[PDB]
């Protein structure tokens, strides 16, 4: 996770404008709509059969908020992503059995969501910094797998 100071500033700047609750719901919902295979982990969430059923599902929205809340907290610790996400890593592996490739898909969907929300302001250099952060978070969540 080699971030330059100016990259780190770019990441933090934009993130301060993000409504985490709403963005969380969108990113998780889009993941489940664009990559329907990821639905294998959420059968307890009820109806996920159409895009409106997924996007407006209260449990998807609430889970999105929880996921992104932990992600934000991660942005406050860019110098120690691995320690920050250690217990979550173990959980995703030993209890939830989530193939880490899914963290990479979520990262890329999150990046489209940020582009969708911010338009122009999500310039090529800003996207590049976010790509590094999403990859770092995905790697940190995968680090305790065994």
């Amino acid at each position: 996770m080699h971030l330059t100071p100016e990259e780190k500033s770019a990441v933090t700047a934009l993130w301060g404008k993000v409504n985490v609750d709403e963005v969380g719901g969108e990113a998780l919902g889009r993941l489940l709509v664009v990559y329907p295979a990821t639905q294998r982990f959420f059968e307890s969430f009820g109806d996920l059969s159409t895009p409106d059923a997924v996007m407006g599902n209260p449990k998807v929205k609430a889970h999105g908020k929880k996921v992104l809340g932990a992600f934000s907290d991660g942005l406050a610790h860019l110098d120690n992503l691995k320690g920050t996400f250690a217990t979550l890593s173990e959980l995703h592996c030993d209890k939830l059995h989530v193939d880490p490739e899914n963290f990479r898909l979520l990262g890329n969907v999150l990046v489209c969501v940020l582009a969708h929300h911010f338009g122009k302001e999500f310039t090529p250099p800003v996207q590049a910094a976010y790509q590094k952060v999403v990859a770092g978070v995905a790697n940190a969540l995968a680090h305790k797998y065994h």
């Binding site: 709509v33 664009v34 990046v111 582009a115 090529p124 996207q127 590049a128």
Partner: protein, 141 residues
Amino acid sequence: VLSPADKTNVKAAWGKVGAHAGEYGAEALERMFLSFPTTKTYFPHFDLSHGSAQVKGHGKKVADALTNAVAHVDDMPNALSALSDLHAHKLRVDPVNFKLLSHCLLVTLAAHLPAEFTPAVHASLDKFLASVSTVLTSKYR
């Protein structure tokens, strides 16, 4: 396979792109070069500075080919045959790279088409770029 609804979604979204294709193509490329630097290894003969003319020109060609695939959405492997041969026999770009350009095109469309880039359209577009990538890569070996 694209479904009837996917096709409808792609024609609609690309129709709003209209005469911006070239520009969005060049932006997708710049996004790709900056976010995924390994992709530059395929363009050592290009000036890759911001605003570069080679980048603008190449963006147009990529966009024109995507416009052609949209126009022939029910016959893509034949409409893109020539491009498939070029990529397989001359350029020989590793397939992972197609996924990276596809992602960057999606980001570009999201950044410019806020009202059209709904969840359903995002899904159809992702499937559409994946089909295009499969065609361009189908004759490699």
